[PDB]
Each structure stands twice: as structure tokens, then as C-alpha cells.
Amino acid sequence: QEPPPMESPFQREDRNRFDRDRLFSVVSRGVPEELTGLLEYLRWNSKYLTDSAYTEGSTGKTCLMKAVLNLQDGVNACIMPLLQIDKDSGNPKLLVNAQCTDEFYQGHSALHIAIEKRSLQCVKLLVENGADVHLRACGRFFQKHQGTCFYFGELPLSLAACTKQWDVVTYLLENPHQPASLEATDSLGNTVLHALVMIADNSPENSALVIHMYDGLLQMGARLCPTVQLEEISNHQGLTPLKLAAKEGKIEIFRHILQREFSGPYQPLSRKFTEWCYGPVRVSLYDLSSVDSWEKNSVLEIIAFHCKSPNRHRMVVLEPLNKLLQEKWDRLVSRFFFNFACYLVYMFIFTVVAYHQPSLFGESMLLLGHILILLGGIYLLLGQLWYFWRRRLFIWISFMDSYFEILFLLQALLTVLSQVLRFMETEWYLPLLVLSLVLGWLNLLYYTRGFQHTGIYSVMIQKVILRDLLRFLLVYLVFLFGFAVALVSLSREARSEPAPYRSILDASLELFKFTIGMGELAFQEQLRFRGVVLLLLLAYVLLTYVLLLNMLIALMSETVNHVADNSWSIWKLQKAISVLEMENGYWWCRRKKHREGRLLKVGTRGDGTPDERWCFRVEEVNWAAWEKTL
Amino acid sequence: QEPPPMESPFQREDRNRFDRDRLFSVVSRGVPEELTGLLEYLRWNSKYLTDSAYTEGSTGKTCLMKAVLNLQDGVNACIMPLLQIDKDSGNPKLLVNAQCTDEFYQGHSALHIAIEKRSLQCVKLLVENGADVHLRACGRFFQKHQGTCFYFGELPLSLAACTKQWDVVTYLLENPHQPASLEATDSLGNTVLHALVMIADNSPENSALVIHMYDGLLQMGARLCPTVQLEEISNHQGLTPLKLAAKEGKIEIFRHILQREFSGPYQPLSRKFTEWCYGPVRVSLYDLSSVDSWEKNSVLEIIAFHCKSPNRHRMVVLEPLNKLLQEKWDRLVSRFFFNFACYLVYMFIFTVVAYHQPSLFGESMLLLGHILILLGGIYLLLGQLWYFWRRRLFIWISFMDSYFEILFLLQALLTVLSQVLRFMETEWYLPLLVLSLVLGWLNLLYYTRGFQHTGIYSVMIQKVILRDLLRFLLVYLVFLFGFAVALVSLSREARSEPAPYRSILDASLELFKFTIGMGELAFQEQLRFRGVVLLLLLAYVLLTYVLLLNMLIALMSETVNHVADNSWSIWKLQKAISVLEMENGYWWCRRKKHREGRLLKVGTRGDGTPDERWCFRVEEVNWAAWEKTL
């Protein structure tokens, strides 16, 4: 069953002396007088406009919704008589407050539609007869997801500020009948600021919209709600608008929120206080309330771990994240390269043990090597398990940025399973041990991200190619399997040395050896159908080469498009993940975090008491920006 | 410890009846009257405004700096009473001349801040009470380096002309109290013209700024300082603004300085005198004072050797460098190709000697061949040593442009070591000799730069690829080493011919042979774990191929971007290095240099005497430029 459309001129409403159809037909055109005779009717049989007689069957839509959904020049003269009629009939559930009850448009009041229709002269008439302004609308059509959806915060005020409706916000905040509390929260927990950041796109025009509405709304709250801090309020997940804009991926408003500047009035609700400029240089004291890992759910921990957005790496470059992570990394590079040295020692010892191996004093040395390998593996395994315990979901998020933890876990697990399989006298321990050795020598490549010159190239290597290559792999695998079965099912026959293509796997090998550049094709004599095997081999080689060339060319056209080199940002982000995870310290010695930034007395908060915030002074010199001012 | 910020509204100043805090708090707001009671106080206890009581502890900042750092509409009415107060108290070290003493803002007078604040009406009040205008400010914050820095010449005048402040330069040069000497020099030795070229970027807007300020300032010096030549003055390294702009890499002002044209007044301070135009052709007499190698530190020797900038090769194309180097090369190509013939003779003789070799009349011929090889090697070694003696630092500068000298030195050294190791009866002389032969046949490729058609392609070959390829080399080397150790530590075991993968190096070979296109993979029987070796080999081949393709694609996206073909410029520069080094002649016969250009009497210099300069007439025909004028 499809959801009933809110307003269909053609499709009459469902059903699941004025009957409902006549009332709708007279309220749609907008004439007031054709309503006469209705009021007394209700007094005769005690019906009410909100009873299921006159409402739409499915969505519970009432008359007022129909009245407003059909406006002419923003005003429909039939609305006021409806309110007067309901007040005269004396209805318990006031008509204006009536909401839908379907799962699609739940809570969809009559006021949201007036706000969307951009008609203030109707919002006035609505709120001026008892319309409530906190009616959260939590229907599925309003919750953000894939498909048809419109997320605005499930609130009249949030919908006005979300819909550029400047003149309606001032009214909803400045009427004596029922002012809207600017800090109201919906089901999910969002206030209006969160809706603003949830609808924001990276697109420039919509980000301009949201920047403007955010600043204006915030100043308005500064006037109306001076005591309470609108910015620090969190939702039910535990995130503030800044953290939400960081997590969802909305950058272009995250930047403005992070480094916003106000002067004179509304100075306090600023996060970038320009300390001193001199020619080109500017020393600015960026606030970092809730962007320092010293808290529990800081913006860093959200950007790095919880965010899933292809522009996540563009948030770390912008100030003050860059200078902050640079200071942290300069502080912790010692411990990082010490980790590197320890792991390299472990791998060298592992190699030595794998290179001297009995085949069914040196004895004691090798025994100690085995034991030390076991201790290293159990330590590393506990480390990665504590990791994955802290970050349950991370690999669901970013496989291509965080698969090296998976490989470290795999290496530890394989080496420990290998050691116990050795102590179980089994002869299957050498394969697993040597495979763990391979994996370790490969996982060494993770530690190259400390250096710039090499991490740049590593992140110029680890591109999303692999997912594209997998599909070529599928096609080529079908090609190979089919042609191999063919060759074997045909060389099986001989004429009237091992027979070439004796099994299916050996055929697959002698077929794959063409891609390498070693494959051998030859007009043979043992086979009865020599010509057919030759022709089939040539068809396979031609097809494989067309396929390789096709994949390579498609890959090229998918890659080389002069796109901006996103290497530096990616490397900075990887270094950030590393340092941000290492700041917690190892699992056995939980390192005591150190606060960042100095605590400064900045003006006076809205309550009148001295405002004291943690700030971080950065010194950004931009010659080009300074030249333009001159 | 971080450097104390010059001006922090929030952070009170450090410390390392008017106390200091009250004085600062009253001078910041800018009211004059709240100063009353200060003067007599100083007379009571003999304190002075420059004593360490009222100054900032760390940076020695005095009150005046605070006064000026907080302006309103460019004027702070509290300044004049401060000067009057200090003069009334009779202080030895005049307050206005007070400077910081920290290592960061050393010498940072009160006048530099007034100049930066773009307030002339305050510079007037400052200089009109004894402010000195030559106070060099040599703090580390001002010296150009990596990081936060602002280089302007460490002088008030240099800062005004560096900061677009036209109206302040005229004042600093045209006041009766203390005019600024336009030829003043800072610590490093730079005058203002050098600061102008040190801040210049290749960016067009900033180069426009610097061109304009340079021309204006130079005319102003022509009026005020007619006797002295502002352009020829050098700094402590021995460079003039032209040589400095060539060395640092600043092209867009180097061009304008080189070919600048003035008419009528200020005609003499021009370097391009238009001799005669005819339709499209223009014969212009470019001055070459200090761009001819006949001097000691000419611009050519700086461009070619001392410059480190990716646009160095764009300076040689522009006139008059192009025509000059073309004439020099046309003169010296004979000697160049004679060098080529001699070296090719030496290499052919070396090949012949290496191709006839005893293994543990022809005797005498081979002995003479050995002896002649030794003489050639010792000659070439002395040549390259004299080279590296003249140019100590060059290879630090441009490895990719000057590594062939390194290879020539290496070849000579190896052949001489080879000959002596032969005369020491050792059997290790043949490897070194043949390696020297390889190196020589390769170093022959240096002499191809005489021809255009082939040097173009050579410089289209020698691109910076190698540095990128090294990092792929690192990754692939780890891959290979790990998988080789694996294969050997697993083939070591056999079932219940040499065993394949018998050592680690042989495994590395049989693994590298896949990249070449010859590698062999095969389901073997000798090994107990045949399946595992097969699977590991396939994983390695797949990984290597993904890696090769990834590197190739990244390299492609890094290269093919329709960038301007910088081949011709690069080849011209290489030919220029060659001819500019060859003009000195060989080390044993120091060739007598020949002057370039004719000596002409151009107008009259500022002293009134006849001006005589060395000029070079070039004939540039530009059809497109001429068409626009019509």
C-alpha cells in the first residue's frame, strides 16, 4: 500500500446537512458563506469536526489542513469561520491542534503547512486562536533516510528557519499568545540548530543559506534566551551541532562554526578572537571547547572514527585542527617511532626464527625465540582486542583507512595458533607461522606514515582501485574456469610425458601463465584435437588481452581527470588517527591526557559573569589575502 | 616557551601612584586626562618610563607600543602627553627610541607599529619628537625563514615601501627633523630594494605591487639621492637587487628590472634603450652591466649555480639572456664538440682495452692502452676536482641538473683505482674497470645536449620520476623480502634437482623474475606444502601487479595534466651551464675571457658627467604585438 498523498485535487479523499465531501469541496474553493447550516447541524447530532466523520480516513487529516493546502495569494477567507465554528461547538480536542495519526505524516499539524506555504497572514490567524507551536511532527516522511523525505527538525520554528522564512521566525518568537521556545527538542533530540546542520549540503548556495540562518537565529537567541547556551545543547545521541556537522560530513558550515568572528555586540558567541594582526600575519585565538581529545566525545574522535563521508579528510586540514594535530604529533612522534622500533625488532626476531627451523645452545636460543614470539603475539592481540573493544563499528566505517588493525590482529592470531599447533606436535605449524611472517613484514608498511615523503606516496597508492578490480576479477575468473574445464575435458582424449592439461587446476595454471607473460602455446601432437586446443587457447589469449586493456583504459578514464591531489589531506588524517589513538596510551598504562590551550578571560558571558574559555593561538600568515586589502 | 604575543587584549602582560597595569589600562582606552598624577610620581621616586618597572618583563615593550597598538581612526590622543611627560621627567634613553630586547621582536620600535597601522597622523607626532628612523629591527620574527615570519628589510622606510604606504615614504624622505637615508642598510646588509625583491612572489598581483613600488622609490631616489647609485649597492653576501632577485628565484620582477624602459625624465636609470623600431622589428640596446660572465659574480653564474628554484629555467629564456647565451654557444660549440670527440676517443680506447684482456706486440699495445687510460682518467679526475673546488655547493643545489659531473668523477676514480689494483697483481681489477666502462658509455649521454632535436627528448626524459619511484621501490622491496623469506623457510621442508628456493637470494630472484615477464610458477611435488607455496606465489603476483598498476596510474595522474612543455627552457639552461663553465676554459689553460657588447655613451648620469655603459643590441620581431598597436 502506498502512502496517501497529502493533497490531491483529482483523487477524492479516502474513507478508511454537510457531509465530509461537501465540506471539503466548499473549503477548497475558499468561499465562507457556503458554510452556513453547518454549525447547527453539529449541535443536532453532537458531531465534531475532529471526529472520524469529517476527517480523512487514513491520515486523520482534518478540514483545516485542506483549507490551508489550497491558498490564493496566501490567504483563504474560509479559515477564520472554521475556527469560530469549532469554538462555538465547544470541542474538547481543539481543531487547530489536530494532527495526523498515520505512520507517514504523523503529527503533521495545520501550522506546518501554513509555514511552508510562506503565508504569514495565515500563521497569524492560526496562532491567534490557540494553535500550539511545539507540536513535533515525527512521521516517517519527515525522518531523514534514503528516498522521499524532508527533514527540517519536526518543529514549526525549525521549519521556518529551515525554509528561509525570516519573517515567520520573528513572529513565532515574538507573539504574546504562545512564543516558541528556541531550545525545544524533537523526538530524536535535535533542536533547530541540529536540523540546520542536518539539511546542510556541501553545496555553496545551501551552505550560504545555512550560515546566514544560523548566525541570525543565534543572535536572536542571544536576545531572547541570554541565559541559556543554544550551542552547547546536545541531542539524545550526545552530540552538539558542531559534532553533528562533523559527523554527518557537513564541512562548509563546520568551518564557519569553528572559525566564526563577531565584533561588538554578540561578541561572546564567537569562537575566533583575532588577537593581533601585523601586515600579513594574524595571530588568532581559536576556541577549542569540545574539539580537544581531553573530553570524552570530542570532535576529533568523531571526525576520525564515527564519520563516514568522502570529505572527512578535508576537515582536518582547516584550522585550528591542523595546528593542534601538528603539535600533538610533534609531541608524540617519539613514542610512535619507538613503537616502530619495537615492532621491527619483533619482526626481525620472527624472521630469524622462521629462517632456522628444525625439520622433523642453538636449541635453547630457538626455544626462547619461540617463547618471545608468543609473548609478542599475545601482547599485540590484546592490544588490537582492546582497540576493537573501544571502537566497535570502525571497520564498518572505513575499511580502506583502518584495515591495518585487522591485519595486525590477524597476524597475532595466526602466530599464536601456530605456536600452540607446534606444541600439539602438528606439522601444520610452519605454514601458518610463515604466513604470519609475511603478514608482519607487510604490516610494517603501516609505520611509514610518520614521514611525509613516503606517506604521501603510500596514500597515492592505497586508492579505491581494488573495488573496481574485483569485478574484472570476477569476469576473468569465469573466463579462466570455463576455458580450463574445456581444455582438460578435451586433452583428456589422446591420439591413437604427462598429458598437458591433466587436471583442472593445472589447466588453470597453464592458462593464468599468459597474464604473467610466461604462458606457452604450441601446436601439439599428443592430443587428438590439437587444432581445437590451439584455437581455443588463442581465443582465450585474445579475450584476456582485450579484457586487460579494457579494464586498464576504463580505470584510467576513471582516475586521470586532473582532480585535486587529495594526498596531503589524507596523510594528515591518517597521522591524526594514529596520534589520537596513541594519546590514550597503551592498554596497560592508560596515559594521563594533557589539556591543550590556555584558559583566558574573554569579555563577559550572557549571565554577566566573567567568561573564561580554553583558547589556542595560531599564527597564520597569508601574503595573498593581505595584498588584496591594500 | 612560546614567544610573548605583541598585543593581547585578554592576556595581561607578563612581569618577568600609577603602577604598570594601571598605565597600560589607561593608555589602551586612549583618554589623556586619566594620566594626571603620573608625572609628579616619577619625580618622587626617580623612576623612568623606560625602567624595568613599567615595561613588559619579557619583551621590554614600553608604554608607547601599547598606545599605538590600540588606535581608533588612526589617532590615539594619549600619545602626545606621554612624550611630553617623558621630556619633562628628563629621561636619558628617550622613550620614543626605546626598543624591545627579546630574541623574537628585537629592535621592534614604536615607529614600525605606527607605520604598519597605516596611520600617518601618528607617524608625524612620533617623528616630531626625536624618533630615530634608522632603528634596525633584527628580531627572529623578522628574519625570513620557515614558519611565522615577516621580512620587510628591518627598517621603517623599508616597511613603508614594503607595505604600499606611499604617503609615509614621502614623509620619511621629506621631513626636516630626521630624513631617512634611502641607502641605509640593515644587519644582513640589505637596503630597501633588496627587501622589495625578497618579499616578491611570482604571483602577478604582488609582482605588480613590487614593480610599482620599485619604480616609484627609484625615481624618488633619483630626485633625493642623484649622486649615489641605489641599484648597484650590494649587501654583505655580495649581491645587488638584480642578482638577489635572480638567486632567490623571483622572476617577474627580475624581468622588469632587466628590461625596463623610461623616457624623458629619469631616462638614465633605464636598462633597455629602444634604438630603432621598424614595423614589427625592434632593435633594442639592452644593458648588461652585471649580467656578463666577464665579472666575478655575474647574474649568469648565480642563475646557473647558486639558484635553487623550480622556475630558474624561465629566467634564461627571457631577453637579453637568450641572445647572449646563443652567441656564446655559437662561438663555443666547436670546443664543445671537440671535447666530445676527445672523450669518445677515450671511451673507444677503453672499450678496446676491456675487450682484449689477459686471463691470468699486442702486449706492448695493451700496455700503452692501460697507460693512456690511466692518463685520461687522472686528467678527467683533476678536471672534476677543480670543478667541485670552484663550485662547492652545486650538487646540494641541483642533483638532477648536475649529476653528470658526479658520474664523471666516479668513472675517473674507478678507473684509476682499477689500474692501481692491477699493478697490485689483484684479480679484482676487471670488475671495477668494466664498471667504469659502463659508466663511461653512459656518461656519453651528457654530450647530446649540443643538438636541439636530441636534448629536447633527453630533458623530456630526465624528469623527477625517480624520487617518486623510490617509494614504490621501498614497498616492493618489503613485499619481495618478506615473501622470499617465506618461500625459503617453507621449501626448506621436503616430501617424505636443486630444491627450488634453496636460499633467500635465489628466492628473491625467482620472485623478481615475475616483474620482468619470465617468472615461473608451477604446482610442484618436492615440497611438502606445495599448495601453500603456490597460493603464496599467486598472492605475491597479484599484489605486485596491483602495485605496479597503482604506481603507474598515480604517476600518470601526476604527470599528464596538459602542463606547459618546459623542455625548451630546460635544454637552453643546460646548454647555458655547459657554456658558462667552459668559458673559464680547462683548468690548465685558463682561457682569457672576452667582453660582450659595445660601449656606448648614453645621455648623462646623475652627476652630470657622460654616461658610458656596455650594451647589447637584440633584434626582436613580434608580428602579433605590432598588429595590436595598429
PDB file of N, CA and C in Angstrom, chain A residues 279-280 282 620-630, chain B residues 205-206:
ATOM      1  N   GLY A 279      50.625  43.246   9.362  1.00  0.00           N
ATOM      2  CA  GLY A 279      50.806  43.062   7.950  1.00  0.00           C
ATOM      3  C   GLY A 279      50.084  41.824   7.473  1.00  0.00           C
ATOM      4  N   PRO A 280      50.832  40.818   7.064  1.00  0.00           N
ATOM      5  CA  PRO A 280      50.211  39.563   6.644  1.00  0.00           C
ATOM      6  C   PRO A 280      49.866  38.631   7.784  1.00  0.00           C
ATOM      7  N   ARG A 282      48.574  36.925  11.148  1.00  0.00           N
ATOM      8  CA  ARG A 282      47.446  37.095  12.039  1.00  0.00           C
ATOM      9  C   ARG A 282      47.551  36.027  13.106  1.00  0.00           C
ATOM     10  N   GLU A 620      48.809  32.425  11.530  1.00  0.00           N
ATOM     11  CA  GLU A 620      48.653  32.166  10.106  1.00  0.00           C
ATOM     12  C   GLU A 620      49.011  33.414   9.312  1.00  0.00           C
ATOM     13  N   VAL A 621      50.002  33.283   8.439  1.00  0.00           N
ATOM     14  CA  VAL A 621      50.466  34.372   7.591  1.00  0.00           C
ATOM     15  C   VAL A 621      50.017  34.094   6.164  1.00  0.00           C
ATOM     16  N   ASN A 622      49.185  34.979   5.616  1.00  0.00           N
ATOM     17  CA  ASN A 622      48.679  34.836   4.254  1.00  0.00           C
ATOM     18  C   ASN A 622      49.047  36.090   3.468  1.00  0.00           C
ATOM     19  N   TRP A 623      50.113  36.013   2.674  1.00  0.00           N
ATOM     20  CA  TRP A 623      50.529  37.170   1.890  1.00  0.00           C
ATOM     21  C   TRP A 623      49.480  37.567   0.861  1.00  0.00           C
ATOM     22  N   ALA A 624      48.879  36.586   0.194  1.00  0.00           N
ATOM     23  CA  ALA A 624      47.882  36.878  -0.830  1.00  0.00           C
ATOM     24  C   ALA A 624      46.655  37.583  -0.266  1.00  0.00           C
ATOM     25  N   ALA A 625      46.154  37.132   0.881  1.00  0.00           N
ATOM     26  CA  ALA A 625      44.977  37.769   1.460  1.00  0.00           C
ATOM     27  C   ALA A 625      45.266  39.209   1.843  1.00  0.00           C
ATOM     28  N   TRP A 626      46.430  39.447   2.426  1.00  0.00           N
ATOM     29  CA  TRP A 626      46.812  40.789   2.835  1.00  0.00           C
ATOM     30  C   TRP A 626      46.953  41.732   1.648  1.00  0.00           C
ATOM     31  N   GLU A 627      47.475  41.236   0.531  1.00  0.00           N
ATOM     32  CA  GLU A 627      47.677  42.089  -0.636  1.00  0.00           C
ATOM     33  C   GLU A 627      46.363  42.661  -1.147  1.00  0.00           C
ATOM     34  N   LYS A 628      45.304  41.853  -1.147  1.00  0.00           N
ATOM     35  CA  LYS A 628      44.013  42.316  -1.646  1.00  0.00           C
ATOM     36  C   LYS A 628      43.470  43.476  -0.823  1.00  0.00           C
ATOM     37  N   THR A 629      43.653  43.437   0.495  1.00  0.00           N
ATOM     38  CA  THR A 629      43.113  44.502   1.332  1.00  0.00           C
ATOM     39  C   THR A 629      43.719  45.848   0.966  1.00  0.00           C
ATOM     40  N   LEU A 630      45.014  45.870   0.696  1.00  0.00           N
ATOM     41  CA  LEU A 630      45.702  47.095   0.332  1.00  0.00           C
ATOM     42  C   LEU A 630      45.142  47.690  -0.957  1.00  0.00           C
TER      43      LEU A 630
ATOM     44  N   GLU B 205      49.821  39.726  -8.858  1.00  0.00           N
ATOM     45  CA  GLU B 205      49.392  40.905  -8.111  1.00  0.00           C
ATOM     46  C   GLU B 205      50.514  41.461  -7.246  1.00  0.00           C
ATOM     47  N   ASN B 206      51.227  40.588  -6.543  1.00  0.00           N
ATOM     48  CA  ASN B 206      52.297  41.059  -5.680  1.00  0.00           C
ATOM     49  C   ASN B 206      53.475  41.551  -6.503  1.00  0.00           C
TER      50      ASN B 206
END
